Design a protein around this ligand. Structure first.
Ligand SMILES: Nc1ncnc2c1ncn2[C@@H]1O[C@H](COP(=O)(O)OP(=O)(O)OP(=O)(O)O)[C@@H](O)[C@H]1O
Ligand SMILES: Nc1ncnc2c1ncn2[C@@H]1O[C@H](COP(=O)(O)OP(=O)(O)O)[C@@H](O)[C@H]1O
Ligand SMILES: Nc1ncnc2c1ncn2[C@@H]1O[C@H](COP(=O)(O)OP(=O)(O)O)[C@@H](O)[C@H]1O
Ligand SMILES: [Mg+2]
Ligand SMILES: [Mg+2]
Lengths: 77, 48, 242, 49, 48, 49, 49
């Protein structure tokens, strides 16, 4: 559900406020197979839950950081 | 459907949970005493 | 020494249930009470211990009040459906041909299921079957409310679902929260950080606004972000001004 | 003000830049004197606004 | 009711105590309404 | 003056940063002008004067 | 009627000029898109006033 919301916001809201939104849709299309159940992100997250961290690990912290820097990747494009 | 099984299931859940809690705390204590690991705030409280 | 003190520790729950089911019009009030009070005792001392569980006199009182309301609305619905299907409405047979046990189970489910953790629900239903054999609970399916929820979810990029589909549990929680909102004037959403609570109540508020035509205004207050004086108010120590 | 570049230093510069870019809040955790504030300030030197 | 009326006759206040949910405030309100009195409920705190 | 001469950054740092900020603001505003070269649209830019 | 057509014609002329007038923009070292044509613009504004 979180992945779906992230992808929908990427394909809907431009980062500037359109070429930016077209880049967003293309990037969302590329990352779509990874953002799925039993995908790369899900397995990586459930594995990271087994590692030790300086602070307590929360799923949404990692997900929000990931979405932030993916938005930055779109900005870089 | 067995109330007895429900009660014993709750009991074993609670007992096991507190069991690994205590065992992990004691393991951390013995590692601290051997100098293997640093003493944390929770570990400081537990030792004191 | 200026007060006479009285210890009231154990209220007479069974008598309260008996009398206040007898008054509401339940003919099997004795059996209903003798089945419902031990059911609450069993819920208290058979389900998993959680900090957000209450099975005291307040819960039973709310259950019985909701049971009376549900019986009234079922009688109204039976009258309405009979009038549009024929002319045979009389109070005697409607009262006689009325599933009081089903009404009580419906009220109990509507008020207790939302508070339960995932693994306790089968225990609750097994207890209900043991104490109320044969009686089943079938929640009404709110078509218009679900449609409004789906529209709001699409508008705000939320993942609406139904049944076992992805997001079905979230919509179930929203519907349960709506039911409790109707029943209670005090609500509390317990759950780990980022379980969808904020978005759940926001979506429900928007759906209610679009459905009933009365628009909802929500004031969000962080009680611990300010001192209690700034939260409730101050009585001026010198001028006695509030 | 001077910063000697290092593998950890440049990696943290990139991560801080990609996090502060959208004005997302963030926290640097580490032992005292590790270089958290200097990393933050060297990251802000790349953001004049 | 017996204890509270005995307290009232002695011109003494009443103090029903116990765990929450036993119907103390409601009992006092019901007794007050039975005697046709105006009963005001105050949720006391440290600011009183 | 600011871009062409490389010694000014070494010799006049803070006002180099200030001019850089002014240049970014100026470029953004005149990009807004460029996408809508109409006189009235430029006049209708919020807080333009 | 025929006399007042002069004033309405002036109003329409001013309206159409200012709805079709475009700023003259030319590239500047591939860095920005600067504006020229200050004299004619100023003359148009003052003559319309
Ligand atoms: N039904 C849903 N479908 C898709 N995304 C959702 C849904 N519900 C919540 N989210 C998203 O997942 C995150 C959960 O945040 P939300 O505020 O809903 O949860 P919460 O349990 O109220 O959080 P908290 O108590 O930690 O503040 C948010 O990023 C939100 O946008
Ligand atoms: N890569 C580096 N290059 C230059 N100096 C460094 C580097 N890493 C650490 N230092 C030195 O270590 C110190 C870090 O202290 P500081 O950043 O103030 O700690 P904190 O961020 O915890 O307050 C700085 O004074 C800096 O001189
Ligand atoms: N004798 C009674 N008859 C009917 N309801 C009762 C009785 N005693 C308690 N209750 C119910 O219990 C609920 C909680 O009682 P309350 O007085 O608020 O608890 P407390 O004793 O903690 O103040 C009330 O809603 C009230 O209706
Ligand atoms: Mg929340
Ligand atoms: Mg009370």
């Amino acid at each position: 559900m979180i992945f779906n919301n992230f992808l929908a916001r990427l394909r809907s809201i431009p980062l500037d406020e359109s070429p930016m939104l077209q880049i967003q849709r293309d990037a969302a299309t590329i990352m779509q197979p990874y953002f799925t159940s039993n995908g790369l992100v899900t397995k990586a997250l459930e594995h990271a839950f087994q590692l030790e961290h300086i602070m307590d690990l929360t799923r949404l912290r990692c997900l929000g950081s990931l979405f932030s820097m993916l938005h930055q990747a779109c900005r870089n494009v | 459907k067995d109330p007895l099984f429900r009660f014993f299931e709750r009991e074993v859940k609670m007992g096991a949970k507190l069991l690994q809690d205590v065992r992990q705390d004691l393991a951390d204590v013995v590692q601290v005493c051997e100098g293997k690991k640093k003493q944390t705030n929770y570990l400081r409280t537990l030792i004191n | 020494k200026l007060f006479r003190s009285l210890a009231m520790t154990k209220p007479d729950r069974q008598l309260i249930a008996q009398v206040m089911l007898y008054s509401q019009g339940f003919r099997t009030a004795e059996v209903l009470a003798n089945k419902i009070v031990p059911f609450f005792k069993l819920c208290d001392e058979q389900l998993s211990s959680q900090s957000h569980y209450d099975f005291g006199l307040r819960a039973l009182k709310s259950v019985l009040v909701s049971a009376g309301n549900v019986k009234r609305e079922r009688i109204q619905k039976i009258k309405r459906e009979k009038e549009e299907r024929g002319e045979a409405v009389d109070e005697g047979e409607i009262a006689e041909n009325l599933p009081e046990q089903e009404i009580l189970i419906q009220s109990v489910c509507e008020t207790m299921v939302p508070k339960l953790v995932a693994e306790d629900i089968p225990l609750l239903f097994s207890l209900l079957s043991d104490v109320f054999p044969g009686v089943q609970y079938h929640r009404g399916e709110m078509t218009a409310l679900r449609e409004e929820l789906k529209k709001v979810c699409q508008e705000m990029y939320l993942t609406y679902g139904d049944g076992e589909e992805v997001g079905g549990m979230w919509v179930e929680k929203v519907l349960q929260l709506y039911q409790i909102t109707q029943i209670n004037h005090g609500l509390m959403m317990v759950g780990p950080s980022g379980s969808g609570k904020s978005m759940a109540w926001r979506v429900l508020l928007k759906a209610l606004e679009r459905l009933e035509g009365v628009e909802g205004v929500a004031h969000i207050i962080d009680p611990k972000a300010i001192s209690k004086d700034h939260l409730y108010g101050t009585l001026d120590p010198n001028t006695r001004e509030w | 003000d001077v910063v000697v570049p290092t593998l950890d230093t440049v990696r943290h510069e990139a991560l801080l830049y990609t996090w502060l870019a959208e004005h997302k809040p963030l926290v640097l955790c580490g032992p005292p004197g590790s270089g958290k504030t200097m990393t933050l300030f060297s990251a802000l030197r790349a953001l004049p606004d | 009711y017996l204890t509270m009326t005995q307290a009232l006759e002695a011109r003494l206040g009443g103090s029903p105590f116990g765990p929450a949910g036993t119907g103390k405030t409601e009992s006092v309100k019901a007794l007050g309404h039975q005697l046709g009195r105006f009963v005001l409920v105050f949720n006391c705190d440290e600011t009183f | 003056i600011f871009t062409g001469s490389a010694d000014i950054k070494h010799l006049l740092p803070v006002e180099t940063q200030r001019f850089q900020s002014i240049s970014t603001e100026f470029l953004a505003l005149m990009k807004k002008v460029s996408k809508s070269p109409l006189v009235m649209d430029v006049l209708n830019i919020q807080g333009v004067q | 009627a025929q006399g007042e057509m002069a004033l309405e014609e002036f109003l329409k002329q001013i309206r159409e000029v200012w709805n079709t007038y475009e700023l003259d923009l030319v590239n500047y070292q591939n860095k920005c898109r600067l504006i020229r044509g200050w004299d004619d613009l100023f003359n148009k504004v003052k003559e319309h006033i």
